[PDB]
């Protein structure tokens, strides 16, 4: 199914040693893989009633609308985990929309 | 939906770096990310119809049964392109069970 084939790519990211998460339109989190939880300290199911700014510290130092226009971009900010960890981390933003959802995949890396 | 949650995914992957693919029980693909076809050099519908052995050109080579029982593993291939470049390889693979499937994700680095 269509379905089978998309459960493929969700076994394939959750395997990827890379922190990999969509967000919505306001920053909420829609989809996790398993590196985003272990970097964040949060469970799948706490990050997916969490939002952006529950985790990054500097959330409200970005220039959101200009990050928008770019439509691609990376850059740096730093993380507060659910132990209190504070680290820096450089992310990676594509926009995309599907029927009625913009969304963003986002790729993290631990600086 | 169950859907929607997988076609995150589904975009995430495909806009991963790295190429990652899944391959079946007797190596044949059933999800290729778009890095996966940028590096074969073959296009996603053609990869569908294809197996592990018309890319890799050492298949023969591997202890497939010992590599099987690892269960988690990663070593260096050749693989040939579409358009017959022949180039190294590190492929990591873990196996991995949904439902009556057997099929290993593959993460596939350029050396």
């Known amino acids: 199914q269509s379905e089978l084939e998309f459960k493929f790519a969700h076994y394939l990211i959750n395997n990827a040693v890379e922190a990999s998460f969509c967000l919505g339109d306001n920053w909420q989190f829609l989809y996790v ?4 939880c272990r970097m964040t300290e949060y469970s799948r199911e706490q990050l997916l009633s969490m939002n952006l700014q529950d985790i990054d510290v500097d959330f409200a130092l970005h220039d959101w609308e200009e990050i928008r226009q770019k439509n691609n971009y ?3 900010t730093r993380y507060r985990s659910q132990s209190g960890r504070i680290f820096l981390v450089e992310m990676s933003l594509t926009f995309l929309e599907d029927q009625e959802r ?6 993290v890396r631990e600086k």
């Open 33 to 36: 893989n398993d590196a985003t």
């Open 74 to 76: 990376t850059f740096k």
């Open 102 to 107: 913009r969304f963003s995949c986002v790729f």
